[PDB]
Amino acid sequence: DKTVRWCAVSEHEATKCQSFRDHMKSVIPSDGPSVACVKKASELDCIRAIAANEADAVTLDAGLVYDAYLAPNNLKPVVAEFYGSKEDPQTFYYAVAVVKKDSGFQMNQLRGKKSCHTGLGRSAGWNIPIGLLYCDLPEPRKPLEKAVANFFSGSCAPCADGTDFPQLCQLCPGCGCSTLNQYFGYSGAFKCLKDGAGDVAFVKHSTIFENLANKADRDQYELLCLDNTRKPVDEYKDCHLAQVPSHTVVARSMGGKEDLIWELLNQAQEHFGKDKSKEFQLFSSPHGKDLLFKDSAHGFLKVPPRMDAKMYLGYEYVTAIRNLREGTC
Numbered sequence: 175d176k177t178v179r180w181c182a183v184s185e186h187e188a189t190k191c192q193s194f195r196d197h198m199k200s201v202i203p204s205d206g207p208s209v210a211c212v213k214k215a216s217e218l219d220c221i222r223a224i225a226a227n228e229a230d231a232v233t234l235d236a237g238l239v240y241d242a243y244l245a246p247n248n249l250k251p252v253v254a255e256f257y258g259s260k261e262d263p264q265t266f267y268y269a270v271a272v273v274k275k276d277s278g279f280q281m282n283q284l285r286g287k288k289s290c291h292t293g294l295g296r297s298a299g300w301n302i303p304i305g306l307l308y309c310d311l312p313e314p315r316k317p318l319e320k321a322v323a324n325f326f327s328g329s330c331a332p333c334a335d336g337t338d339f340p341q342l343c344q345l346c347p348g349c350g351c352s353t354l355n356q357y358f359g360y361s362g363a364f365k366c367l368k369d370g371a372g373d374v375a376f377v378k379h380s381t382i383f384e385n386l387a388n389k390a391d392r393d394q395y396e397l398l399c400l401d402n403t404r405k406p407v408d409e410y411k412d413c414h415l416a417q418v419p420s421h422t423v424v425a426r427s428m429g430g431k432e433d434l435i436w437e438l439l440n441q442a443q444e445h446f447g448k449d450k451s452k453e454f455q456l457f458s459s460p461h462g463k464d465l466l467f468k469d470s471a472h473g474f475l476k477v478p479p480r481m482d483a484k485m486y487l488g489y490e491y492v493t494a495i496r497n498l499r500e501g502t503c
């Protein structure tokens with residue numbers, strides 16, 4: 175029963191945040207918790223702000239959860255999104271590589287292609303695909319951006335430094351790290367492919383389904399599998415790059431209001447979860463896709479007491495991330 179300062183990244187998320195706040199007021203008693211909205215330019219800024227006691231919560235892709243746990247931020251995950259359905263919640267998802275039908279190349283022929291990424295340091299759009307191509311990348315592999323810029327003949331990697339690596343923002347000038355960059359995120363990375371700027375988009379299994387309603391439109395796309403073959407977008411379970419942890423809401427390790435955060439989100443998913451309301455929806459919005467939370471999420475699950483980021487992500491994934499900034503071949 176106090177205020178939770180939610181960190182909204184840019185204009186769109188801010189708008190949804192304002193709606194979230196108002197609708198919650200109309201249904202949460204006077205002794206219930208409330209939402210306040212803080213607008214930031216990026217997720218990176220949100221991490222700082224929470225650590226500096228300027229905000230209290232923000233949902234992050236598991237890839238960014240690692241950087242949020244690192245000093246001097248020291249944030250911890252408190253609430254996780256789950257996908258699939260309520261009967262059988264999936265606390266993970268599939269990273270896939272989407273391409274257009276008959277484009278003519280396999281996984282082993284990516285050098286020279288144009289790639290569309292959700293964002294720098296993110297699970298599906300960066301960490302996984304780059305981790306798999308790592309050794310096939312040219313040297314030096316430090317900084318990593320360098321190698322990626324030289325592997326592909328241009329790409330869109332939101333949040334990257336366009337000054338230092340201009341090839342990385344070739345498909346999306348500036349490399350905007352928010353929805354203001356139309357090619358940002360899952361659906362942004364997909365549009366980058368659909369519009370014809372890129373040859374491959376690294377997103378999740380639900381992305382194409384979230385964007386193309388007709389099975390006939392989806393039939394014009396395919397998935398690149400690790401065995402250098404292609405498969406239909408609905409056969410992602412046999413044709414994906416990896417399984418990664420679900421997105422999660424992070425908070426301060428000290429005086430982080432984890433109790434209020436859970437109390438709020440739990441009431442939120444009950445009143446405005448999937449199919450629960452005509453006035454407001456927590457997992458969709460006329461203002462855009464994946465705002466504040468993923469459209470593909472069906473609810474939340476409280477993370478076990480005082481769990482750290484390494485434990486949440488898993489040693490295998492943590493290990494994958496570490497090598498990404500070091501590794502040999």
Ligand SMILES: [Fe+3]
Pocket residue numbers: 235236296297298421
């Ligand atoms: Fe993600």
